[PDB]
């Protein structure tokens, strides 16, 4: 039962079910203590059973229990743990992650097969802790807190921050992703190249594997952190290493429309 | 009484309790039929149950009656003035002891909490809980700066003497978690109350000198 910024209170639906169950149980206890007739006690026991059923699995038997003033059924434990929006498929099999960005993709013809064009500001935000450490190492900032305060305001960022960022990303790679990830080559590791602008530059030869053209597509960027993650991305997931299709064994990064026409 | 927070069967059971009370208190000598006296108790039980069990955040009965009277007065003024009344009219109509501030506070109190599972938009994949951040657990940045401050303060206290550092870390609660007092710290070292106040001040002055000569600790003060 959390209080929102505006002062209003927000609560989950389990509290209402618990309140119903507790009220019915206490009223049954009082009725039993009063020597109530059998009809009243039977009705109260039936309501207690129905309240327990609604708490455990709402809507399975009978009309779903709804919050007064609305027709929306209350969310019970079974509803929490089941469905496409349940705990498993929404929070366990898939999650939202940090050090992740997203932007529109454009074609980069000058890039190598293992390179991609990453905007400077996206790189600054994604590699922020490494950038703060590098800034502390040099004379740009006295400590990490000062560097972070410096990066908070756009007009307070000097020009050596970009050189530090260029130093930080040396050797590292990032994972580019396009949804839906139909096969395993929908996620590919590329060596970022800092570019001016706000759109990601994509190599033409990896478009067929990504199924990505340039009429408005967007892609997500992920930053592996440790040495195991970087080693796996550079050795196994690198774009220049996955040249044949895992399904048929034929080349999948091969000449395409304009290249075929020109040759 | 339906549609006021409680289901029909809950109202029926509360009325059954009231009926049991009426049977207990009924007297047949007065020659009045049972329904006449039982209706009072049934309505009393139902109304008390509504006042006690219709809200997630329970509100006392007197406050519930005040809210109901305020709502009735507001509705009457709204239907008479041909518009939604302001707080001043409502306060004037309620009677003595009522002003706009009290009306606003009562309206603020009468706000029901909103469910965390209310969908927004036609798409059934978004809820209120998806937009409410958790501000209780410290963020990674906060934990990191706390650790950095602790490390830098420990490195700063090394320059102090072996006992002066202990005196400061005891008076500031850096050892047991809770701050001690000069008498309590004095018992630990056998020193009187007054002496500790001077050695602690001297150590604080020395730390100020070191900070002025290094400025490696001013950033953590925000």
């Amino acid at each position: 039962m959390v209080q929102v910024d505006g002062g209003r209170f927000a609560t989950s639906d389990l509290n209402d079910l618990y309140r119903r169950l507790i009220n019915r149980n206490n009223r049954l206890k009082k009725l039993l203590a009063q020597g109530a007739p059998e009809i009243i006690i039977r009705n109260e026991k039936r309501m207690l059973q129905e309240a327990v059923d609604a708490l455990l699995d709402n809507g399975r038997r009978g009309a779903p229990v709804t919050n007064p003033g609305s027709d929306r059924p209350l969310r019970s434990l079974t509803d929490i743990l089941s469905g496409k929006q349940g705990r498993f498929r929404q929070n366990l099999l898939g999650k939202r992650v940090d050090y992740s960005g997203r932007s529109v993709i454009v074609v980069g013809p000058q890039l190598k097969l293992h390179q991609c064009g990453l905007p400077k500001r996206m790189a600054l935000e994604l590699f922020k802790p490494f950038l703060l450490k590098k800034m502390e190492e040099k004379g740009i900032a006295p400590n990490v807190k000062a560097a972070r305060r410096m990066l908070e305001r756009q007009r307070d960022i000097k020009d050596e921050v970009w050189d530090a960022l260029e130093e930080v990303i040396h050797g590292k790679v990032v994972l580019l992703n396009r949804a839906p990830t139909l096969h395993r080559l929908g996620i590919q590791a590329f060596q970022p190249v800092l570019v001016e602008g706000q759109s990601i530059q994509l190599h033409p030869l990896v478009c067929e594997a990504f199924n990505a053209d340039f009429d408005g597509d967007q892609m997500a960027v992920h930053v592996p952190l440790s040495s195991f993650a970087q080693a796996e991305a550079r050795i196994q997931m690198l774009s220049a290493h996955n040249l044949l299709s895992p399904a048929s064994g034929e080349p999948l990064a091969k000449p395409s429309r304009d290249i075929i026409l020109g040759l | 009484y339906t549609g006021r927070g409680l289901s029909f069967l809950d109202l029926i059971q509360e009325g059954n309790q009231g009926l049991i009370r009426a049977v207990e208190k009924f007297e047949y000598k007065r020659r009045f039929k049972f329904s006449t006296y039982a209706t009072w108790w049934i309505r009393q039980a139902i109304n008390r149950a509504i006042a006690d069990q219709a809200r997630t955040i329970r509100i006392p009965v007197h406050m519930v009656e005040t809210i109901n009277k305020l709502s009735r007065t507001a509705r009457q003024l709204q239907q008479e003035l041909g518009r939604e009344p302001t707080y001043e009219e409502i306060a004037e109509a309620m009677g003595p002891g009522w002003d706009a501030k009290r009306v606003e506070e009562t309206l603020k109190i009468a706000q029901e909490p909103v469910s965390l599972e209310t969908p927004i938009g036609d798409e059934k994949d978004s809820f209120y809980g998806d937009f409410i951040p958790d501000e209780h657990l410290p963020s990674p940045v906060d934990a990191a700066t706390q650790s950095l401050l602790s490390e830098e303060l420990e490195k700063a206290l090394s320059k102090l003497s072996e006992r002066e550092a202990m005196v400061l870390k005891l008076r500031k609660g850096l050892i047991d978690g809770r701050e001690h007092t000069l008498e309590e710290v004095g018992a630990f070292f056998g020193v009187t109350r007054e002496r500790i106040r001077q050695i602690e001040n001297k150590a604080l002055r020395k730390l100020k000198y070191h900070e002025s000569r290094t400025r490696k600790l001013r950033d953590f003060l925000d």
Binding site: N43, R46, E50 | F8, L9, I12
Partner: peptide, 16 residues
Amino acid sequence: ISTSDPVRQYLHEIGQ
């Protein structure tokens, strides 16, 4: 009367 409807069942029980 109706097994799945509590209100109707209660009314049937009290009607006896």
